[PDB]
Amino acid sequence: GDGYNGFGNDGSNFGGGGSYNDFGNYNNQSSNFGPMKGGNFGGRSSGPYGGGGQYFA
Amino acid sequence: GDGYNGFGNDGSNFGGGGSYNDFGNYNNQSSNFGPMKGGNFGGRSSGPYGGGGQYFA
Amino acid sequence: GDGYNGFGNDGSNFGGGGSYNDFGNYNNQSSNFGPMKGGNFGGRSSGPYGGGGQYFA
Amino acid sequence: GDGYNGFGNDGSNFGGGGSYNDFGNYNNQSSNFGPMKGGNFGGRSSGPYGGGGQYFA
Amino acid sequence: GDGYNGFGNDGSNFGGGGSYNDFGNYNNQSSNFGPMKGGNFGGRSSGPYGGGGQYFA
Amino acid sequence: GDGYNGFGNDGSNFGGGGSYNDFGNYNNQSSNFGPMKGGNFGGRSSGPYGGGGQYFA
Amino acid sequence: GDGYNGFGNDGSNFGGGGSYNDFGNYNNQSSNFGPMKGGNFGGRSSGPYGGGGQYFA
Amino acid sequence: GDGYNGFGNDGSNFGGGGSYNDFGNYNNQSSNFGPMKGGNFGGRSSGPYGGGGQYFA
Amino acid sequence: GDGYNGFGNDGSNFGGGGSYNDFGNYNNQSSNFGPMKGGNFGGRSSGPYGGGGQYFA
Amino acid sequence: GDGYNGFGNDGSNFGGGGSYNDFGNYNNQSSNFGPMKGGNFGGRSSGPYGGGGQYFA
Amino acid sequence: GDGYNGFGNDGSNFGGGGSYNDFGNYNNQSSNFGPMKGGNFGGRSSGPYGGGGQYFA
Amino acid sequence: GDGYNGFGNDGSNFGGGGSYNDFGNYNNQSSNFGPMKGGNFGGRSSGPYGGGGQYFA
Amino acid sequence: GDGYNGFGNDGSNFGGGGSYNDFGNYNNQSSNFGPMKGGNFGGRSSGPYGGGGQYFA
Amino acid sequence: GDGYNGFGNDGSNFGGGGSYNDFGNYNNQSSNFGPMKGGNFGGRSSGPYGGGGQYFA
Amino acid sequence: GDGYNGFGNDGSNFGGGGSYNDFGNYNNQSSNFGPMKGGNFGGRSSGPYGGGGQYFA
Amino acid sequence: GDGYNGFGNDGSNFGGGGSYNDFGNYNNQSSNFGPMKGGNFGGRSSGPYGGGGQYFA
Amino acid sequence: GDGYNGFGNDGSNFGGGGSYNDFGNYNNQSSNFGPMKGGNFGGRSSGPYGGGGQYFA
Amino acid sequence: GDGYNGFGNDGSNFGGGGSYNDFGNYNNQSSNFGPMKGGNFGGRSSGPYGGGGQYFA
Amino acid sequence: GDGYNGFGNDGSNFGGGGSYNDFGNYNNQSSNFGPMKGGNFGGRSSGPYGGGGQYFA
Amino acid sequence: GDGYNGFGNDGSNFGGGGSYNDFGNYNNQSSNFGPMKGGNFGGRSSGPYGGGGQYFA
């Protein structure tokens, strides 16, 4: 099958080292190593029901 | 079969080393090592019901 | 099947080592090693019912 | 069957070694080693009922 | 089936060595070694009933 | 059947060795060794009834 | 079935050896060895009844 | 049937060896060895009745 | 059935060896050796009745 | 039928050898050896009646 | 049924050999050997009646 | 039924040879051997009636 | 089958190290190493139902 | 099949190092290394239903 | 098969290092290394149903 | 088969280093390295249904 | 087959370094390196249905 | 087989460095390096259906 | 086979460096380097259906 | 076989340095380097169907 011979995969210290950073919500922020099946996704929404609006600002 | 021969996979110390940071809600911040089946996802929302709104600011 | 020959799988010290960090709610912050089935997810919400809103600030 | 030959799996000292850190609520902060079936999740919420709102700040 | 040949699995000393830290509420903070069935989860909430609000600050 | 041949499983000294720490409420802080069925969970809440709010600060 | 050939399972000295540490309420701080069925849980709450609130500070 | 061949299970000296520590209320702090059925839990609460609040400070 | 061949189970000297410690109330602090059925629990509270509050300082 | 072949089960000298230690109220602090049915518990409380509060400090 | 072949069950010398200790009230401090039915419990309380409070200083 | 083939059950010298140790009321400090039914308990209390408070210091 | 011989895969410190950054919502921000099947996606929305609008300001 | 002999693959520090940046919604921001099947996508919107508008401003 | 012998592949620090940048919605902004099958796409939209309009301003 | 021997494949710092930019909606902004099959596309729109217009300004 | 020996392939810093720029919708803005099959496309529109107009102001 | 021996291939800083530039819709603004098969295209339109007009101004 | 030995293949800074420029719709604006097969095309329109006009004001 | 030995192939700064320019629709504006097969084309149109007119002004 497929293979992977990566040396030095790092992927570390996600936040970057800035202070006062705000991490939003429903994100995918994972670090994944090794064979993966099923793919990688972001957050999912089903929007508000019964006429509720969805607002970003 | 799919292989993986990674040296130095790290993925450590997520927060980055900054202070006063504010990690989010429902995030997938995990670090995963080894064969994975079923995919990697962010957070999921079924939005408010009965005309409740969803608001970000 | 699938394999994993990883040397030095860190994933440690998640908070990053900064002080005054605030960790949010319903997150997935786990560190997972070994073969995994069923996928890795963030948090999940069924939003408020009967006209309650969901608010972020 | 899927294998795992990880040498040196850390996942330790989660908090990072900073002081005055404030850990979250309903988070998944576990460290898991060995074959896993059923998947890895964050926290789950069913939002308030009868028109109660859900608020973050 | 699946297998796991991990050498040195650490996963120890969760709090990180910081002082004045405040570990939160309903979190999953366990360290789990060995075959697992049924998945790993965060906390769960059924939100307040009868119009009670849920508030984070 | 799923195997596990982990050497040096540690998982010890949870609190991290810092002083003046506060371990919060309803957390899962266990260390589990051996084959597990039924999954690993955080704490659970059925939030207040009859219009009582749930407050974090 | 499943198996576990762990050498050196430790899991000891939970509090970490810090002084003035405060251990909170309803936690699961157990150390568990051997086959486990039924899963590992944190604390459980049914919130106050008749309009009493639940507060953390 | 599931096996377990753990060498050196330890699980000892829970308090950590620090002085002036204060262990909590209703915690599960047990050390359990041998095959377990019915799961491991934290403490359980039914909150106050008749409008009494629940307060952590 | 389920087996256990553990050598050196220890589980001893719970208090840790520190002085001036204050073991709390209603905890489970037992050390249990052998086949266990019915699960392991923390303490239980049916919170105060008739408008009495529950307070942790 | 389950089994247990543990060598050296110890579980001894509970208090740890520290001095001026206070062993608080209603704990379970037993050391139990052999087959067990009905599970292991902590202390149980039914809170005060008629508007009496429950206070920890 | 279940079996137990424990060698060296010990369970001895509860107090730890420290001095000036207070083995406080209503604890279960027993050491029990041989097959047990009906479970193991801590102390039990039915709290004060007629508006009397319960106070831990 | 259920068996017990233990050797060297000890369970002796409850205090560990410390000095000026003292014992609280209603403790269970028994050492029990052979088959048991009905379970092992700590002390039981029905708290003061008529508005009398229960106090620990 | 397809190969990968990457040296120095970095992918680290996602946030860039600026302060006061606000990571958004439902994003995919993962770092993925090793063979992948099923593709990589952004976030998904099923937009609001029953005449609710979707607003970006 | 296809091959890849990339030396020094960087892909790091996504945010760029600017402060006060506001990362978007539903984006794909991942860094992916190793052979990929199923393509790479942005976000997906199934726009509002029942006459709700979609507005970007 | 197709080959790739690229030395020094950058793709880093995506945002450019400017401050106050706003990252859009549903973009693809990933950095991808190694054999790719299935193609690379932007966002996808199905416009509002039932006579709702789509507006960019 | 087709080859690629490119030295110095930059493609970094997409945003350009200007401030106050808007990296607008549905774009494809990825940086792709290595052999690619399936083609590279922009965003896709199925325009509004049931007489809704599509508007740019 | 076909080959490519390009030295210094830049393609970097797309935005140009201007401030207040406004990147578009559904564009293809990717930088792609290495052999490509299936062609490079812009965005695609299936224009509004049911008599909805398409307007560029 | 066709070849390409280009020294210094730029294609960078697409926007040109002007401010307040507006990047339109569905464009192919990609930068492509290496062998290409399937050709390069602009955006594609299928005009509105059911008598909707298409307007540029 | 056909060759190309070009030195200094610029094609950069597309927008030209003027401000307030308005890049149009469905254009092909790519910069393409290396052997190309399938031709290079502008945008495509399948003009409106069912009596809709196409207007360039 | 054809050849090409151009020095300084330029093709840059397409917009021409002018401000307030308005680039057209469906154009081909690409800059292409290396051998090409299939020819270079402008835009393409299929005129409006069902009696629609095509108008330029």
Nearest CA in chain G to H51: G52
Eight-state DSSP code of residue N40: B
Give the burial string for O11-41 (b: 16+ CB within 10 Å, else e): bbbbbbbbbbbbbbbbbbbbbbbbbbbbbbb
CA atoms of M24 and S54, how far apart (whole Å): 39
Please answer whether residues C10 and E11 qualify as being in contact, where contact means their C-beta atoms are separated by less than 8 angstroms.
no
CA atoms of C14 and D16, how far apart (whole Å): 6
CA atoms of S13 and Q28, how far apart (whole Å): 17
Distance of residue D35 Cα from the nearest chain F Cα, in angstroms? 7
Nearest CA in chain N to A51: N52
Eight-state DSSP code of residue P46: E
Nearest CA in chain H to I20: H20
- Read off the tokens for C7: 């040397």
Distance of residue H33 Cα from the nearest chain J Cα, in angstroms? 9
Please answer whether residues D32 and D39 qualify as being in contact, where contact means their C-beta atoms are separated by less than 8 angstroms.
no
Please answer whether residues S14 and Q18 qualify as being in contact, where contact means their C-beta atoms are separated by less than 8 angstroms.
no
CA atoms of B32 and T42, how far apart (whole Å): 50
- Read off the tokens for M46: 């099923």
Q: CB contact, 8 Å: H33 with chain J?
A: yes
**CB-based contact J4 H35, cutoff 8 Å:** yes
**CB-based contact H16 I16, cutoff 8 Å:** yes
CA atoms of M29 and M24, how far apart (whole Å): 10
- Read off the tokens for J19: 């001095």
CA atoms of G4 and T15, how far apart (whole Å): 69
Determine the 3-state secondary structure of S40 from DSSP.
strand
How big, in percent rounded to 5, are the helix, strand and coil portions of chain F? Answer: 0, 25, 75
Q: Do chains M and K touch (3 or more CB pairs under 8 A)?
A: no
CA atoms of E47 and E54, how far apart (whole Å): 7
CA atoms of B37 and B57, how far apart (whole Å): 36
CA atoms of E56 and E48, how far apart (whole Å): 13
Q: CB contact, 8 Å: B32 with chain D?
A: yes
Answer positive or negative: Cα dihedral of N8, N9, N11, N12.
Answer: negative
Which of Q40, Q49, Q55, Q56 has the highest number of chain R CBs within 10 A, making it the mutation to test binding with R? Answer: Q40
**CB-based contact O26 M43, cutoff 8 Å:** yes
Which of Q4, Q10, Q33 has the highest number of chain O CBs within 10 A, making it the mutation to test binding with O? Answer: Q33
- O9 interaction partners in chain N (CB closer than 8 Å): 6, 8-11
Identity of the residue in N2, N42, N43 whose CB atom sits nearest the CB atom of P35: N2
**CB-based contact C11 B11, cutoff 8 Å:** yes
Of the candidates P35, H27, P17, R33, the one whose C-alpha atom is nearest the C-alpha of residue F30 is H27
Determine the 3-state secondary structure of P36 from DSSP.
strand
> Chains with 3 or more CB pairs closer than 8 angstroms to F?
D, E, G, H
Of the candidates C42, G2, C8, the one whose C-alpha atom is nearest the C-alpha of residue B5 is C8
CA atoms of P28 and T31, how far apart (whole Å): 20
Dihedral over alpha carbons D2, D6, D12, D15 (to 10 degrees): -70
CA atoms of Q53 and P54, how far apart (whole Å): 6
Count other Cβ atoms within 10 Å, centred on residue E24: 28
Please answer whether residues D37 and E36 qualify as being in contact, where contact means their C-beta atoms are separated by less than 8 angstroms.
yes
Chains E–F, number of C-beta pairs less than 8 Å apart: 229
Nearest CA in chain J to L40: J30
- Read off the tokens for M54: 């979707």
Determine the 3-state secondary structure of C44 from DSSP.
strand
Tell me how far CA of residue D15 lies from CA of B14, D41, F17, F18, F40, in angstroms.
10, 20, 12, 11, 20
Of the candidates M28, N29, N40, P35, the one whose C-alpha atom is nearest the C-alpha of residue O12 is N29
Longest dimension (CA), chain E: 52
How big, in percent rounded to 5, are the helix, strand and coil portions of chain G? Answer: 0, 30, 70
Whole-number CA gyration radius for chain J: 18
Please answer whether residues J27 and J43 qualify as being in contact, where contact means their C-beta atoms are separated by less than 8 angstroms.
yes
- J5 interaction partners in chain I (CB closer than 8 Å): 3-6
Amino acid letter at E50?
Answer: G
F29: Cα separation from own chain's centroid: 3
CA atoms of T10 and S10, how far apart (whole Å): 5
Please answer whether residues B25 and A43 qualify as being in contact, where contact means their C-beta atoms are separated by less than 8 angstroms.
no
Q: Do chains E and G touch (3 or more CB pairs under 8 A)?
A: yes
Q: Which residues pair with K29 in a beta bridge?
A: none
